[PDB]
Design a binder for these strands. Structure first.
Ligand SMILES: [Mg+2]
Ligand SMILES: [Mg+2]
Ligand SMILES: [Mg+2]
Ligand SMILES: [Mg+2]
Ligand SMILES: [Mg+2]
Ligand SMILES: [Mg+2]
Ligand SMILES: [Mg+2]
Ligand SMILES: [Mg+2]
Ligand SMILES: [Mg+2]
Ligand SMILES: [Mg+2]
Ligand SMILES: [Mg+2]
Ligand SMILES: [Mg+2]
Ligand SMILES: [Mg+2]
Ligand SMILES: [Mg+2]
Ligand SMILES: [Mg+2]
Ligand SMILES: [Mg+2]
Ligand SMILES: [Mg+2]
Ligand SMILES: [Mg+2]
Ligand SMILES: [Mg+2]
Ligand SMILES: [Mg+2]
Ligand SMILES: [Mg+2]
Ligand SMILES: [Mg+2]
Ligand SMILES: [Mg+2]
Ligand SMILES: [Mg+2]
Ligand SMILES: [Mg+2]
Ligand SMILES: [Mg+2]
Ligand SMILES: [Mg+2]
Ligand SMILES: [Mg+2]
Ligand SMILES: [Mg+2]
Ligand SMILES: [Mg+2]
Ligand SMILES: [Mg+2]
Ligand SMILES: [Mg+2]
Ligand SMILES: [Mg+2]
Ligand SMILES: [Mg+2]
Ligand SMILES: [Mg+2]
Ligand SMILES: [Mg+2]
Ligand SMILES: [Mg+2]
Ligand SMILES: [Mg+2]
Ligand SMILES: [Mg+2]
Ligand SMILES: [Mg+2]
Ligand SMILES: [Mg+2]
Ligand SMILES: [Mg+2]
Ligand SMILES: [Mg+2]
Ligand SMILES: [Mg+2]
Ligand SMILES: [Mg+2]
Ligand SMILES: [Mg+2]
Ligand SMILES: [Mg+2]
Ligand SMILES: [Mg+2]
Ligand SMILES: [Mg+2]
Ligand SMILES: [Mg+2]
Ligand SMILES: [Mg+2]
Ligand SMILES: [Mg+2]
Ligand SMILES: [Mg+2]
Ligand SMILES: [Mg+2]
Ligand SMILES: [Mg+2]
Ligand SMILES: [Mg+2]
Ligand SMILES: [Mg+2]
Ligand SMILES: [Mg+2]
Ligand SMILES: [Mg+2]
Ligand SMILES: [Mg+2]
Ligand SMILES: [Mg+2]
Ligand SMILES: [Mg+2]
Ligand SMILES: [Mg+2]
Ligand SMILES: [Mg+2]
Ligand SMILES: [Mg+2]
Ligand SMILES: [Mg+2]
Ligand SMILES: [Mg+2]
Ligand SMILES: [Mg+2]
Ligand SMILES: [Mg+2]
Ligand SMILES: [Mg+2]
Ligand SMILES: [Mg+2]
Ligand SMILES: [Mg+2]
Ligand SMILES: [Mg+2]
Ligand SMILES: [Mg+2]
Ligand SMILES: [Mg+2]
Ligand SMILES: [Mg+2]
Ligand SMILES: [Mg+2]
Ligand SMILES: [Mg+2]
Ligand SMILES: [Mg+2]
Ligand SMILES: [Mg+2]
Ligand SMILES: [Mg+2]
Ligand SMILES: [Mg+2]
Lengths: 136, 290, 191, 197, 106, 172
RNA sequence: AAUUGUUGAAAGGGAAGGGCAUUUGAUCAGACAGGCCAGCAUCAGUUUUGGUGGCAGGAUAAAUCCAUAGGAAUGUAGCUUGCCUCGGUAAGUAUUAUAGCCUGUGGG
RNA sequence: AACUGGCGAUGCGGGAUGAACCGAACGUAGAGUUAAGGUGCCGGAAUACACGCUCAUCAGACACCACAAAAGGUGUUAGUU
RNA sequence: UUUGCUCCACACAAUAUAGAUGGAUACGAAUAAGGCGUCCUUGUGGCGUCGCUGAACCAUAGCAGGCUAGCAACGGUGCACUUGGCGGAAAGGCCUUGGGUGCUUGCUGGCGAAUUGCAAUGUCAUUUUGCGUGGGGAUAAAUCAUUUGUAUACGACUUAGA
């Protein structure tokens, strides 16, 4: 009999927290929280992603669960160097979040024929699976 | 302006509309709270008001100036021959209130009750319930399911019974039929009880004993169109007054520029439904008894 | 002015295990078990080690942060209430009519039947709260003793008795009759 | 978009649900609302009880029949909030209202149908946390609504028959999820992978 | 197979109006799944049809159509104004309407 | 007043025969465009020297871009304002990333907290705060603790369609 | 004519009648034999909404970036010290070291 | 009483409502753009964005306009010495 | 009173329609937290994983979807039957057994499509009623008048009459 007290483990506003922009000429780009302005503004910089160092309202951005070693106030070059170091982009790219994003980008770019081609394939996949769903 | 002298209103507003009742048999709008631990029996009975008389008895009221002394008291007498059970009715609870889901009827139905379902008995072919009576023919099948549904569901069980009005001096033949909630144990016992009593008869003493407080639920004797003075107990206007004096002088202030609901007007007096309570049973007579 | 973070410590003793899912707290120690619902209050619990738990309020105003401590207190009293336990002593007072107290039971109830208050013919009753035990103290005159694990159940069962004996229509400075809480404390001695 | 939209009333702020339900109606969309008794109102219980009593005292002086009518049931409370946002004396208004049904609990048909939720009237998303609110069935009961216990009884039973439904269902999707796994890595699968599926 | 629709579903909302004066010469059409002005500039110029039934057969059919065209966007939520060869009948408010794909430009 | 720009403005009483080349005085003005900014320039100049636009002349009007526009800075702000009952002097502290961004939010606060519209407000001084622990007000001092972090609970996500088939989750 | 009966058609949830508009029903003119209507294309007038190209100003934007000198702390490495399950902490020194930041000047 | 502007003699958009306020002055129409005023729903039009403030057991909610004061508050918010 | 009534079947007709046009796709609860998978000591449990919107999921190819052949599978789906079971909140619907039969675009074939002329919804929904045909099933009452008086201004109410 130990205590056992829930958790509630939140994503945090902190230096080196990577953050997915959601509205602006960046929007869909990752970036990192350099310094921290107040309860609602932050300083972001995402030189790898092409997003320019700026003060951004935290409402237009979504905290990811990614983090990395970044010195508070670090300039853009320092940011570029620490980012690559922690290998952020691979860490994010391989996550269910960023895969789901790419997956709907694809379904948007499907040509009418490719869309017809998906239908037949699903027909095929469904035939064999509806079978297997009757033998064990 | 302001009355002048304050005084209480004539009449009680919780008895509107003072209209004629929808039927001679006033409705039992409520039944005793159920205690499913007791045996099951009826919770109300049917009779015919016969008359009134006087009674003498010793009063037992420690502290009253009439303790251990004789009083004379007036008492009514209700004629009360056994009601005959002829159906059970099951009710289910719904967010819109109590709904009846079925009614199982006896197989055999007296011409008394069968008369109730007609307006012109003498001419009629009297086919009432005849196809229902068949439902017993086969093994039982369908009557069981219904009786079974009632046990399966039904938050409340009531019994259709009717009066043996031919055991009464009345001229009236067409008997009276009415539902009576059953207040003994267990839903399933209640229907079992009623099914057992189909066509069978039930007696007053098995409902009421001596010195019990019972309520009466009847339709007030009627008087027809009634002036404002006797109907509402309004002051007679003075003798000097033009165009009548069993009136109400001021029908209302100028504004609201309408006569209002709370103001006594002439209209129907009597034939109202009334639920009178706390009437002690001084005697439960048996007919087979000089 | 919206304070960014403030927390409090909830210290934990050797004989007790507190368990908090959502904000439903359960503390179990020697004297038994107590559970209390905190859903109404918007704080973040965080274990650190079976002798320590923290409660925190993120970005909170006065009225919120001010509710943070009183969450600590509440859980503390649950912890102590189940190690030591709680014991409230009240002592009857009357100027001429002996207040006459007993424990009556109608339908497994257990009540506190006060009689003759200020010489009243009335019979006052206070119900005994589940979790509280009432003993009438031997060795001391006109004492009553309510004991239990729930401070809030005792302090109230206490207070419901003292109030059943309020004095109407007399100068309550001269007519001091009543039953009053005279000492609030724990059950296990030395402590 | 769908012939009928069943809304689980639970957790929504009255006037905001009333406001989107109203517009939907007028745009041709049939709508039934369920669980009206688990509706919410901003402000604590007592305020909205008082508010209701203010409403309760208005009536035609000379005949309390013709004056306003005070319905107690949480559905009808809601309907009132809702009819107030429709030009209900026009024909078009009566047209639109017939496309609406409000219900306490989740009665037949709609208990097997899926019900949806209105984010912009969801209290948990709308009300600032720390604000006080009111449940509609509690409010309704304090002002003469009869059937709060019967509804909760029928609902508890319905939730029991539904927890089974779910349970059987989750059990079967475990097969389908397991089936789709062996079909993965196949030719169809990596092709569909390519096309985004 | 089961589907055949070559149009986008639509809804006849209101006439163009002020608070207290409408203009039957311009209907306001809600296009399914068009939610901004920028989305609805695609449908500008498409032809609209309101199909409806009648009791008297005419040219050997009991089915009649009022034809129109999306002409401009409306407000911020992808509502779209449109005009018809004959104004729409104000009972149609909330009825279904068919926005076609032509005059196309893909 | 809008979104702000900062101007250096320079003017000088019109040259006279007997006093040519008068003195030149500068102000830094926070306004949304160059026209308001010269209106403002003259507004204050008449509150110090004997001049008015009619008898003086603007010499130069120049935007002053933030020297370090991505360097988070702790600003102290000094302000005169009239309230309803009278006129008072304040000092507030704004932590933003450029003078112009902060003068903006000052004006919001004055309007929100003290109901002061733009006309009633005199910026007297806005300056960067060099050392920490010259920061006085605590609503700023909070944000200068070492290794600072904080979560953002009860996350609310702006729905894009009118209905929803889940049931939201304020998780973060 | 008011007003009335019959027949036929039609509408009517506390009046009726009216305006603009259209559905439906009824009814009718005219015109075809170029009459009525449409669709596309190329233009013209008015207008609305996008994509994209070339240039001008400014502190010849301010930044980032690079170079350089200086600096400090919400002090990185190292060191010292003190507990402390073999290092991890804590408080001291310590300004680039096994992070970096700030300030000025210069370059494009 | 004064100067101007109006209503009267005047409709149209706004102010729910309203002679005089705001906007704007009228031949019959089409397309466009606006004013004053609006854009949760009634109702055309962002349940738009941004920073604060306020929780009222009789909150508050837009000029004219359909009222409230002295004086109080250890409610909370920023300030002054 | 001119073969009337009802339920199933089809036929022709009329008359409708607040507005079909792939699918209303079922836990509950919490939100300062939860869903799912998994393991166990079955807990306020361990471990894993997910969210950041249904932009889903399912269905979707064939004369508006014609006539036909084969293979591989033993799967899927429509239809009428039949086995057992569940559902009363408005249940009037849900689940399960077994054969019969149609389809299958799981894959591989043969034939057809034009001239509706370069667009003209190009007609494929479901409402109610009406008339004959024949496959089941059923054979009343209420009202006027008369009468009671527990009723009544008149209607109405309550009685009685093969
Ligand atoms: Mg969790
Ligand atoms: Mg897609
Ligand atoms: Mg008086
Ligand atoms: Mg007198
Ligand atoms: Mg009752
Ligand atoms: Mg009842
Ligand atoms: Mg006496
Ligand atoms: Mg039945
Ligand atoms: Mg008769
Ligand atoms: Mg009479
Ligand atoms: Mg008389
Ligand atoms: Mg009397
Ligand atoms: Mg006289
Ligand atoms: Mg009188
Ligand atoms: Mg009256
Ligand atoms: Mg006193
Ligand atoms: Mg006295
Ligand atoms: Mg409409
Ligand atoms: Mg519609
Ligand atoms: Mg009224
Ligand atoms: Mg209304
Ligand atoms: Mg409508
Ligand atoms: Mg919220
Ligand atoms: Mg309309
Ligand atoms: Mg308009
Ligand atoms: Mg037209
Ligand atoms: Mg309409
Ligand atoms: Mg100025
Ligand atoms: Mg001046
Ligand atoms: Mg000033
Ligand atoms: Mg939004
Ligand atoms: Mg009427
Ligand atoms: Mg007309
Ligand atoms: Mg010719
Ligand atoms: Mg011509
Ligand atoms: Mg034409
Ligand atoms: Mg042109
Ligand atoms: Mg350009
Ligand atoms: Mg340049
Ligand atoms: Mg150097
Ligand atoms: Mg570092
Ligand atoms: Mg004027
Ligand atoms: Mg004039
Ligand atoms: Mg004039
Ligand atoms: Mg005018
Ligand atoms: Mg107007
Ligand atoms: Mg206006
Ligand atoms: Mg007004
Ligand atoms: Mg104005
Ligand atoms: Mg003016
Ligand atoms: Mg309204
Ligand atoms: Mg609108
Ligand atoms: Mg917008
Ligand atoms: Mg009030
Ligand atoms: Mg008061
Ligand atoms: Mg008052
Ligand atoms: Mg209010
Ligand atoms: Mg004013
Ligand atoms: Mg004051
Ligand atoms: Mg104050
Ligand atoms: Mg001062
Ligand atoms: Mg219709
Ligand atoms: Mg369900
Ligand atoms: Mg579950
Ligand atoms: Mg979980
Ligand atoms: Mg699990
Ligand atoms: Mg096990
Ligand atoms: Mg478990
Ligand atoms: Mg677990
Ligand atoms: Mg899904
Ligand atoms: Mg086929
Ligand atoms: Mg083929
Ligand atoms: Mg084979
Ligand atoms: Mg086969
Ligand atoms: Mg039912
Ligand atoms: Mg229903
Ligand atoms: Mg049924
Ligand atoms: Mg088959
Ligand atoms: Mg197919
Ligand atoms: Mg066709
Ligand atoms: Mg026939
Ligand atoms: Mg005979």
């Amino acid at each position: 009999t130990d205590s056992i007290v829930k958790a509630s483990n939140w994503r945090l506003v902190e230096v080196g927290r990577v953050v997915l922009i959601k509205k602006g000429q960046s929007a869909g780009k990752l970036a990192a929280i350099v310094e921290i302005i107040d309860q609602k503004k932050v300083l972001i910089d995402g030189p790898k992603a092409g997003v320019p160092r700026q003060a951004i309202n935290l409402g237009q951005v979504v905290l990811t669960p990614l983090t990395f070693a970044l010195p508070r106030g670090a300039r853009t070059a320092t940011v570029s160097k620490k980012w690559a170091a922690a290998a952020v982009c691979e860490k994010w790219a391989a996550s269910s979040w960023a895969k789901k994003i790419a997956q709907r980008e694809r379904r948007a770019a499907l040509t009418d024929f490719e869309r017809f081609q998906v239908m037949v394939l699903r027909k095929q996949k469904r035939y064999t699976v509806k079978k297997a769903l009757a033998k064990a | 302006s302001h009355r002048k002298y304050e005084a209480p209103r004539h009449g009680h507003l919780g008895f509107l509309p003072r209209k004629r009742a929808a039927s001679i048999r006033a409705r039992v709008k409520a039944f005793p709270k159920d205690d499913r631990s007791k045996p099951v029996a009826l919770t109300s009975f049917l009779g015919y008001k016969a008359g009134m008389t006087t009674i003498v008895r010793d009063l037992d009221r420690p502290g009253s100036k009439f303790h251990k002394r004789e009083v004379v008291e007036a008492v009514t007498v209700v004629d009360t021959p056994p009601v005959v059970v002829v159906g059970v009715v099951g009710y289910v609870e719904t967010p819109r209130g109590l709904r009846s889901l079925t009614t199982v009827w006896a197989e055999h139905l007296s011409d008394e009750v069968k008369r109730r379902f007609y307006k012109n008995w003498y001419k009629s072919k009297k086919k009432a319930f005849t196809k229902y009576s068949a439902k017993y023919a086969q093994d039982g099948a369908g009557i069981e399911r219904e009786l079974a549904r009632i046990k399966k569901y039904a938050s409340v069980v009531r019994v259709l019974v009717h009066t043996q009005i031919r055991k009464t001096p009345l001229a009236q033949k067409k008997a009276h039929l009415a539902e009576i909630q059953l207040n003994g144990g267990s839903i399933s016992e209640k229907v079992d009880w009623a099914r057992e009593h189909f066509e069978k008869t039930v007696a007053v003493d098995s409902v009421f004993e001596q010195n019990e407080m019972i309520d009466a639920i009847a339709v007030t004797k009627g008087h027809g169109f009634e002036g404002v003075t006797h109907r509402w107990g309004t002051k007679k206007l003075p003798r000097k007054t033009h165009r009548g004096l069993r009136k109400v002088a001021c029908i209302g202030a100028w504004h609201p520029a309408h006569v209002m609901w709370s103001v006594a007007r002439a209209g129907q007096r009597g034939y109202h439904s009334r639920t009178s309570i706390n009437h002690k049973i001084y005697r439960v007579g048996k007919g087979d008894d000089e | 002015m919206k304070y960014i973070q403030t927390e409090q410590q909830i210290e934990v003793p050797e004989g007790v295990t507190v368990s908090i899912k959502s904000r439903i707290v359960k503390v179990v120690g020697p004297r038994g078990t107590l559970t209390k619902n905190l859903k109404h209050i918007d704080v973040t619990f965080t274990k650190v080690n079976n002798q320590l738990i923290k409660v925190a309020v993120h970005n909170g105003g006065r009225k919120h942060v001010a509710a943070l401590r009183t969450v600590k207190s509440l859980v503390d009293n649950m912890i102590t209430g189940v190690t030591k336990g709680y014991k409230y002593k009240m002592r009857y007072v009357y100027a001429h009519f002996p207040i006459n107290v007993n424990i009556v039971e109608k339908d497994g109830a257990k009540f506190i039947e006060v009689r003759n208050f200020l010489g009243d013919k009335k019979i006052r009753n206070v119900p005994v709260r589940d979790g509280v035990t009432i003993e009438f103290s031997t060795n001391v005159k006109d004492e009553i003793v309510l004991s239990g694990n729930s401070v809030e159940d005792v302090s109230q069962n206490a207070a419901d008795l003292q109030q059943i004996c309020r004095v109407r229509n007399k100068d309550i400075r001269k007519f001091l009759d009543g039953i009053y809480v005279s000492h609030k404390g724990f059950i296990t001695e030395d402590l | 978009v769908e012939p009928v939209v069943v809304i689980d009333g639970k957790g929504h702020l009255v006037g905001r649900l009333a406001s989107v339900v109203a517009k939907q109606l007028l745009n041709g969309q049939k709508i039934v609302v369920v669980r009206a008794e688990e509706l919410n109102i901003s402000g604590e219980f007592f305020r909205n009880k008082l508010k209701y009593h203010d409403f309760l005292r208005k009536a035609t002086a000379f005949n309390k029949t013709r004056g306003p009518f005070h319905f107690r049931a949480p559905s009808r409370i809601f309907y009132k909030a809702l009819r107030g946002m429709v030009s209900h004396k026009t024909a078009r208004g009566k047209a639109a209202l017939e496309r609406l049904k409000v219900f306490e609990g989740i009665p037949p048909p709609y208990d097997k149908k899926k019900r949806v939720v209105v984010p912009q009237a969801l209290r948990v998303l709308r009300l600032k946390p720390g604000r006080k609110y009111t449940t509609l069935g509690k409010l309704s009961t304090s002002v003469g609504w009869k059937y709060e216990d019967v509804v909760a009884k029928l609902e508890a039973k319905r939730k029991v028959s539904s927890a089974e439904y779910y349970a059987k269902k989750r059990a079967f999707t475990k097969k389908v999820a397991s089936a789709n796994a062996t079909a993965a890595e196949s030719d169809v699968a990596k092709q569909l992978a390519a096309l985004g599926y | 197979a089961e589907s055949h629709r070559l149009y986008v579903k639509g809804k006849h909302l209101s006439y163009q109006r002020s608070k207290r004066v409408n203009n039957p010469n311009v209907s306001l059409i809600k296009i399914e799944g068009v939610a901004t002005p920028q989305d609805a500039q695609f449908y500008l110029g498409k032809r609209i049809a309101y199909v409806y039934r009648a009791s008297k057969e005419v040219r050997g059919s009991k089915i009649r159509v009022m034809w129109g065209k999306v002409t401009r966007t409306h407000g911020n939520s992808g509502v779209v104004r449109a005009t018809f060869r004959n104004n729409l009948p104000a009972k149609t408010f909330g009825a279904s309407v068919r926005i076609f794909l032509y005059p196309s430009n893909i | 007043m809008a979104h702000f720009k900062e101007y250096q403005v320079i003017g000088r009483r019109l040259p006279t025969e007997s006093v040519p080349e008068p003195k030149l005085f500068r102000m830094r003005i926070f306004a949304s465009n160059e026209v308001i900014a010269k209106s403002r320039y003259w507004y204050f100049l008449q509150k110090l020297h004997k001049v008015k636009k009619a008898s003086g002349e603007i010499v130069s009007i120049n935007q002053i871009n933030e020297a370090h526009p991505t360097k988070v800075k702790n600003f102290g702000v000094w302000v005169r304002y009239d309230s309803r009952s009278g006129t008072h002097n304040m000092y507030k502290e704004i932590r933003d990333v450029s003078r112009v961004a902060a003068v903006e939010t000052l004006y919001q606060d004055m309007a929100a907290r003290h109901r002061a519209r733009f006309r009633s407000i005199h910026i007297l001084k806005v300056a960067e705060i060099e050392k920490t622990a010259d920061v006085k007000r605590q609503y700023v001092k909070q944000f200068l603790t070492k290794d600072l972090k904080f979560p953002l609970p009860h996350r609310v996500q702006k729905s894009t369609k009118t209905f929803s088939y889940k049931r939201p989750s304020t998780f973060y």
